[PDB]
Amino acid sequence: VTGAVSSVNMRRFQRVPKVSGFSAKVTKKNVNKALDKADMFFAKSVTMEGKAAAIPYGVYGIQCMEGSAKGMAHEKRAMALSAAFRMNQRSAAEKTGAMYENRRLALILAQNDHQEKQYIKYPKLAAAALMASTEVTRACQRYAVPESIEEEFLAASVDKVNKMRGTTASGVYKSSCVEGNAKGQAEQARVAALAVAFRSAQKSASQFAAERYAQSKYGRDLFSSTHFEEGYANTYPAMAAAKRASSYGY
Amino acid sequence: QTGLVNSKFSARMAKKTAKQTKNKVDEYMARSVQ
Amino acid sequence: MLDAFSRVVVNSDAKAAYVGGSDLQALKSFIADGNKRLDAVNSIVSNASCMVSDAVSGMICENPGLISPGGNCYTNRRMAACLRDGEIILRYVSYALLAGDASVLEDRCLNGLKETYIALGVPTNSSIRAVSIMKAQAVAFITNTATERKMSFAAGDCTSLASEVASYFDRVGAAIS
Amino acid sequence: MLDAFSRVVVNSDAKAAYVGGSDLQALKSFIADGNKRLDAVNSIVSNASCMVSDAVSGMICENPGLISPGGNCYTNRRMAACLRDGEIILRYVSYALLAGDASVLEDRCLNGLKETYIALGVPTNSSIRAVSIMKAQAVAFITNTATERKMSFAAGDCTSLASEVASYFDRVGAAIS
Amino acid sequence: MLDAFSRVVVNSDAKAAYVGGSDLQALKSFIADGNKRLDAVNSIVSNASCMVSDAVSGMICENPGLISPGGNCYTNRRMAACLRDGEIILRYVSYALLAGDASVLEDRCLNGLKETYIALGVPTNSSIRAVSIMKAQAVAFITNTATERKMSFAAGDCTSLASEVASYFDRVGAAIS
Amino acid sequence: MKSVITTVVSAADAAGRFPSNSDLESIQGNIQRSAARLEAAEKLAGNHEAVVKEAGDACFAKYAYLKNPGEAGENQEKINKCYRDVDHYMRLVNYCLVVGGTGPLDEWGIAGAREVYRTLNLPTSAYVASIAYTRDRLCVPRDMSAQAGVEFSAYLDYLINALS
Amino acid sequence: MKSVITTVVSAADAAGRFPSNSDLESIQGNIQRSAARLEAAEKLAGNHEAVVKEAGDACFAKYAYLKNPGEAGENQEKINKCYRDVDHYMRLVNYCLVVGGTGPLDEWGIAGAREVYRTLNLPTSAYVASIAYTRDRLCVPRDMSAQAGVEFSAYLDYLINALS
Amino acid sequence: MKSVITTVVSAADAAGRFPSNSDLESIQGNIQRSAARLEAAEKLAGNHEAVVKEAGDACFAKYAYLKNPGEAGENQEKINKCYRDVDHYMRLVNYCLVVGGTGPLDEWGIAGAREVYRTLNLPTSAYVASIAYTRDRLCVPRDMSAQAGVEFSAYLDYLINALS
């Protein structure tokens, strides 16, 4: 049996930080690794408390179906995880644009000053609060139902503006708005989204009436600095439910 | 999802609007009088 | 509108089948207790005038908010409309029990009634209760178990027709809901 | 949304007229009793918490059919929602009285409310009564004629602001009708 | 975010002290010269459009390497983003001078700005100079000592507000450093 | 804290605008009304020992059942912590008279109160009884001036409406 | 229109709050400043004949090249439409003096101007030349009062900064 | 850069598809048209001394007011920077003739130009005057061939339409 002492790398994790030296630099990078795990806990919390509104009474509502055919939930993981991989392939212009764009919108929906200070300090928490805010009050486009064909065209115009920021200034498609990753996965996405379009028309008479006023308020609070924009939000709520935060490319 | 105008295949949002159910009240109200 | 005989004809026309001997056991049994069906319809249409004023007054002593000021049965005009509304539903249910099929009930009475009572502001809770009291009177009059009127009948069993009219009344109630 | 100042600006913009000295007699009189307008709004928002539970309970002792089984205020959830849209209507009326113009009332609160209450089955008779009791409380609180709360004010007349808020409340009532 | 009034409230809340008469000499002097603070903010927001193109062009005249090929202000897109910055920082400094407290400056503008400019490759030395020229324009516009624009003011002294905005600008500069 | 200042510059920051004439015009009312709303501040700050004293026993005089065993004020230290809460609420009203808005109330007494008062069995009616007893005992020329009394009562009833 | 009123009740509506004391306090400045900002309104409204006249020829005196063929003011009807634009902008400044904010300017002259002036080859420098010529010709005791003149110049330079 | 290549493989990448026959067929036109569009590239690259010279003085001949004090070309170094901009734009047109699309123009001259030209008071009409003067002086058998002239003029007028 040989005589093997503990190596030096096995002993460098027991050290004490000294700020006066260069050993401050390794406890730079030891700390933002922990402060991203903090953010991934913060966003995980704020996702779950909003997500608890889709099941208000212990029974799963029809808002969070995922799986109408036999393998539709197993491909949904492959959609979402590849989208999360491509989310951090953006360059330093887009990430720092999206962070400061989310800080203009999280700061106007927060009520107390600590809640706005939290979205200020942690950017993933501010990314998740904006999502959970549009999920519990269904002002997303995946739940917005137009009423007349007038308002359907009125929502199509805003959506055509929103798709244009999914391409570059040249006209080349950006890597954000992408609908496939493999062979036949875009067809799987097309079959997956029409079921959600049918599930949004199966709401109750109370839920349609609630999300009408929630969409008008979302339109006139976040994307209206003028009187004509809020006049459009007050009459066509589905038009107001098609304005994204612009942190998304699509 | 995206509206039917751009990048979209088949027709959607087959849901009862208030105008259509107003017409369905009205046709019954006419039939009762007839 | 259809009846019990034509109901199996649209079922056979869906497959271009002739009505054979399998299909006629249900219809020759419809003929055997046809006299019980006429005797059951005659008991309902005899006391149909008491049944509406029985049921609507029961719906009132349920809920005095209908005769409250501003209530839905507050005016003489509204009470008459409600009384007239109660006679129409009892008429179409007795049509459906006579025909042996619920078809004439839900394209001439219940088709478009929900939206109508929503547009008028007619409260649906009391509409359910006015129909359920009439259903309870129907099973009592068919099985000859009313408290203070007994009718002469030939002896035998009649719970099948009572269950049929009970099946028509909750069709009415689920339609107006 | 608009206010009292911009209301005459859209009236002058319809004819490309400058706002002259004729138009400013209505607005310089809006400034003279502006302190009475702030003193009138402060009296309403002080007792706004009592006003909803005052009015909704008055609407209940009007009509016990709302707390009847199947009634529109029968559940705790439905009673909380009724106490919620009492407060929303009182909030937007106090916005309109503060602004001096009814514009923020009928594109953010009343636009689309009638077909919402028709689609929900909310009875409009009691909706009128819950607004009228709040209107009667508003004229009592502005003119300082409540039974058991008197507020300190400088002496003078205030029936013009009371008539203005009375004009906003029947706008609400005619909208939900 | 906080202002000058709430700044002493969080100082008193740290010891559960009531705000007494000692604390209000600093705040009643904040109100006494309240007209000079509004007159100082109005002079900055009037010439804020000239101030950015003044400062960024001064930053160019000193270092031609920014408009050099490959430089940080070489593209029209990059020049527009730098002019977009010159305005956001001037906007938040005018917020902080209006509020009388630097709190809204360093959690909405400067919190996370240094590592943003490090991650983008934005030159820090060049940045400092764009902020210092805007600071020099701010002290000239508050004390009414610009070369070719003089604004009408009531006579009196204003070096305290000029020193306050000079104290905000090197807070910005030390933050981006 | 929500005040006259922090409202108009966050509305300007959300729109990306410089402070316009409405933003300057809103602070002009903060010059007029601060003569009245600050006069009640030192009046409450100097005599804050008799008001807590006069509200605390009125709370227990309305509700004598709180001193029963098993209730909220059964022993002495619980009554000591009960008077501390009325002192806290009067300190927050003193702060809100100084900022000029309902900032410190909404941050430090209102947000999350409806959870802790239900979890720890504190009856909110006994909380609003003391604030109402402070409210009706305002002699409008004797305690303070007229407008200072209006500004004081408008912050007392805001806390009353928020607690119920 | 962005004014003192429409700012504080949309901040209250976005939070779902009743009008608090800050909301009432903001409108108190709309009582003080409206004596000064309305005094310039009828002064501009009564003498709007000569201000447009004195700005329009100063625009063409700074830029005489606009009357060349192929340019913006080559013929008579184009100069007639050019004076109409300065009349429009002075009417919007008159409106903004009445509302008390930059509402009507931002809705009717500012939003979308940078597209139509580039599409129709209208030089924005010639637009701001007339507004600057109106700005430096303000005799502060002769045209109006002191406060008024400040409120008028603050709306002229806002349009100058927004057009450039 | 938007070109024939980068369009068809990002349309394939967004759909998750391999390069199909349409993707290969689109690059076949990049073989035919590149004989014409590259012939103008060295023609502009070798004689870029005189085109900038002949465009810059035509810009100031159309607009002689720019040399006035207070204007954009008042001193010598501003005119030196003005000729540098026409050299930049002709270099970007030379690049776009080489890639085969409007990539380098849209990235380096078009995006963000409408902000810097309004902020620094640069008149866009004087920018498009030089490009139009380059455009009408194309002798179609003498400067280059016919199709090279078509490809050159189609990139000049794209910049003209984008700047106005």
Ligand SMILES: *C(=C)C1=C(C)[C@@H](Cc2[nH]c(/C=C3N=C(/C=C4\NC(=O)[C@H](C)[C@H]4CC)C(C)=C\3CCC(=O)O)c(CCC(=O)O)c2C)NC1=O
């Ligand atoms: C390049 C080497 C270089 C410049 C470009 C130029 C820029 C510059 N200007 C100052 C000082 C001021 N700048 C001001 C801004 C403006 N002046 C105006 O009158 C209008 C309103 C506005 C732009 C349209 C102001 C007000 C001053 C203060 C003095 C004054 O009365 O003008 C500096 C800093 C100090 C200095 O170097 O002069 C710079 C860099 N100067 C250049 O050197």
Ligand SMILES: *CCC1=C(C)C(=O)N[C@H]1Cc1[nH]c(/C=C2\N=C(C[C@H]3NC(=O)C(CC)=C3C)C(C)=C2CCC(=O)O)c(CCC(=O)O)c1C
């Ligand atoms: C949002 C990203 C985007 C922008 C911007 C844009 O212009 N187009 C999209 C990306 C994109 N997608 C494709 C091809 C397909 N996309 C789908 C999915 C859609 N079909 C559906 O049925 C639904 C939901 C109900 C969606 C989203 C499909 C099925 C294809 C075809 C797949 C294939 O193998 O051909 C393309 C390529 C060009 C095109 O538009 O078809 C792009 C750019």
Ligand SMILES: C=CC1=C(C)[C@@H](Cc2[nH]c(/C=C3N=C(/C=C4\NC(=O)[C@H](C)[C@H]4CC)C(C)=C\3CCC(=O)O)c(CCC(=O)O)c2C)NC1=O
């Ligand atoms: C104080 C505590 C302490 C320890 C626990 C060890 C563990 C340890 N092993 C290695 C290093 C190594 N460790 C392994 C071990 C293994 N690889 C396998 O596939 C097996 C699963 C496993 C053996 C059972 C190997 C193969 C290397 C060499 C890697 C290399 O040379 O590239 C190193 C890096 C230093 C070096 O390169 O030698 C350390 C710290 N040493 C310590 O000082």
Ligand SMILES: C=CC1=C(C)[C@@H](Cc2[nH]c(/C=C3N=C(/C=C4\NC(=O)[C@H](C)[C@H]4CC)C(C)=C\3CCC(=O)O)c(CCC(=O)O)c2C)NC1=O
């Ligand atoms: C607890 C709260 C709660 C939610 C938020 C939702 C959460 C949720 N999001 C999505 C799925 C999604 N959700 C969004 C979000 C939005 N869509 C938009 O257009 C807007 C920008 C935004 C609303 C504010 C998007 C873009 C997807 C598609 C992602 C994907 O399918 O890969 C799905 C199912 C489909 C899938 O993931 O494949 C679910 C269950 N459910 C919940 O129970």
Ligand SMILES: C=CC1=C(C)[C@@H](Cc2[nH]c(/C=C3N=C(/C=C4\NC(=O)[C@H](C)[C@H]4CC)C(C)=C\3CCC(=O)O)c(CCC(=O)O)c2C)NC1=O
């Ligand atoms: C609170 C108010 C109130 C009323 C007004 C009465 C009304 C009433 N009667 C019946 C129940 C009935 N109601 C009738 C109807 C009639 N009976 C006859 O003998 C006549 C022919 C005819 C009216 C003249 C019949 C036949 C029954 C079944 C039991 C029976 O009467 O033998 C029911 C349903 C079951 C029940 O509650 O008993 C109600 C609500 N009862 C009430 O509780």
Ligand SMILES: C=CC1=C(C)[C@@H](Cc2[nH]c(/C=C3N=C(/C=C4\NC(=O)[C@H](C)[C@H]4CC)C(C)=C\3CCC(=O)O)c(CCC(=O)O)c2C)NC1=O
């Ligand atoms: C922006 C403006 C705005 C409003 C005015 C309110 C009004 C309003 N109330 C309800 C919803 C409701 N509103 C009522 C109210 C009443 N029923 C009665 O019998 C009384 C007459 C009245 C109370 C005094 C009830 C009981 C419900 C619940 C219905 C249900 O749960 O089925 C809904 C549908 C959403 C939901 O289900 O909660 C809306 C939009 N909400 C708003 O956002």
Ligand SMILES: C=CC1=C(C)[C@@H](Cc2[nH]c(/C=C3N=C(/C=C4\NC(=O)[C@H](C)[C@H]4CC)C(C)=C\3CCC(=O)O)c(CCC(=O)O)c2C)NC1=O
């Ligand atoms: C049948 C059921 C029934 C009720 C529940 C009460 C409710 C009620 N109160 C008022 C009438 C009023 N209601 C209030 C409201 C209040 N008064 C206060 O002093 C408090 C501040 C606040 C509740 C705490 C006010 C101020 C008036 C006007 C008269 C007054 O109280 O001085 C009215 C309208 C006119 C009237 O009928 O008197 C009604 C219906 N009355 C009823 O008939």
Ligand SMILES: C=CC1=C(C)[C@@H](Cc2[nH]c(/C=C3N=C(/C=C4\NC(=O)[C@H](C)[C@H]4CC)C(C)=C\3CCC(=O)O)c(CCC(=O)O)c2C)NC1=O
């Ligand atoms: C920031 C908050 C804020 C307010 C709450 C109001 C407070 C307020 N109200 C009035 C003043 C007044 N308020 C009233 C109103 C009334 N008197 C009555 O007897 C009626 C019951 C009621 C009618 C609705 C009257 C009549 C005056 C005096 C006339 C006037 O000043 O216009 C005054 C002027 C007198 C003074 O106090 O100096 C003020 C400042 N202003 C503000 O700036």
Ligand SMILES: C=CC1=C(C)[C@@H](Cc2[nH]c(/C=C3N=C(/C=C4\NC(=O)[C@H](C)[C@H]4CC)C(C)=C\3CCC(=O)O)c(CCC(=O)O)c2C)NC1=O
């Ligand atoms: C909320 C606060 C807030 C800010 C302070 C700004 C600051 C800011 N600027 C940029 C982005 C930029 N900022 C600059 C600015 C400069 N480079 C220089 O050499 C000069 C020193 C300076 C101008 C004076 C440039 C040139 C870019 C573009 C970098 C690029 O496009 O690659 C970005 C990244 C987003 C983007 O790409 O646009 C941010 C957050 N934006 C904000 O939202």
Ligand SMILES: C=CC1=C(C)[C@@H](Cc2[nH]c(/C=C3N=C(/C=C4\NC(=O)[C@H](C)[C@H]4CC)C(C)=C\3CCC(=O)O)c(CCC(=O)O)c2C)NC1=O
């Ligand atoms: C709504 C918009 C709004 C404003 C813009 C200000 C406008 C304003 N400024 C001052 C008044 C003043 N402003 C200044 C400031 C200065 N004087 C100088 O010579 C220096 C250059 C500069 C220092 C920064 C001084 C010294 C006074 C007089 C002292 C004072 O009133 O405090 C006054 C009081 C005198 C008066 O005009 O009646 C007013 C109303 N107030 C407002 O309500």
Ligand SMILES: C=CC1=C(C)[C@@H](Cc2[nH]c(/C=C3N=C(/C=C4\NC(=O)[C@H](C)[C@H]4CC)C(C)=C\3CCC(=O)O)c(CCC(=O)O)c2C)NC1=O
């Ligand atoms: C900054 C604002 C602020 C407050 C408002 C209070 C609110 C408050 N009160 C208590 C805690 C308590 N509060 C009370 C008070 C009362 N019980 C009654 O019956 C009456 C209604 C009232 C006295 C008049 C009592 C008796 C306890 C002790 C309960 C316990 O210990 O479980 C606690 C738990 C921690 C503690 O013991 O302090 C808190 C957070 N504290 C604060 O920091």
Ligand SMILES: C=CC1=C(C)[C@@H](Cc2[nH]c(/C=C3N=C(/C=C4\NC(=O)[C@H](C)[C@H]4CC)C(C)=C\3CCC(=O)O)c(CCC(=O)O)c2C)NC1=O
């Ligand atoms: C409500 C606000 C409002 C405005 C500001 C103007 C803005 C404006 N001007 C013009 C149109 C024009 N505007 C001008 C004006 C000028 N050309 C110059 O060189 C000078 C800078 C300026 C005169 C001093 C000219 C010459 C035209 C005619 C251009 C054309 O017909 O193509 C048009 C096109 C329609 C039209 O002919 O009216 C519009 C919308 N109109 C408005 O409704």
Ligand SMILES: C=CC1=C(C)[C@@H](Cc2[nH]c(/C=C3N=C(/C=C4\NC(=O)[C@H](C)[C@H]4CC)C(C)=C\3CCC(=O)O)c(CCC(=O)O)c2C)NC1=O
């Ligand atoms: C890669 C593409 C690219 C461009 C197109 C230019 C665009 C451009 N021009 C200028 C800057 C300038 N551009 C001009 C040019 C002109 N003024 C006129 O009246 C005529 C229209 C034109 C000459 C024909 C002048 C005079 C300046 C100096 C303005 C100033 O310094 O404020 C600047 C500011 C920095 C600098 O001085 O360079 C930029 C980014 N630069 C680039 O990097």
Ligand SMILES: CCC1=C(C)[C@@H](CC2=N/C(=C\c3[nH]c(C[C@@H]4NC(=O)C(C)=C4CC)c(C)c3CCC(=O)O)C(CCC(=O)O)=C2C)NC1=O
């Ligand atoms: C990050 C990409 C990603 C996902 C999202 C999930 C998608 C997902 N959900 C599932 C399964 C599932 N999905 C939901 C609904 C949904 N889930 C919830 O926790 C709440 C609150 C919901 C909306 C009401 C429920 C309630 C179940 C449990 C069914 C069961 O256990 O029987 C299953 C298992 C399917 C199966 O076993 O056949 C998958 C793969 N997985 C992924 O990889």
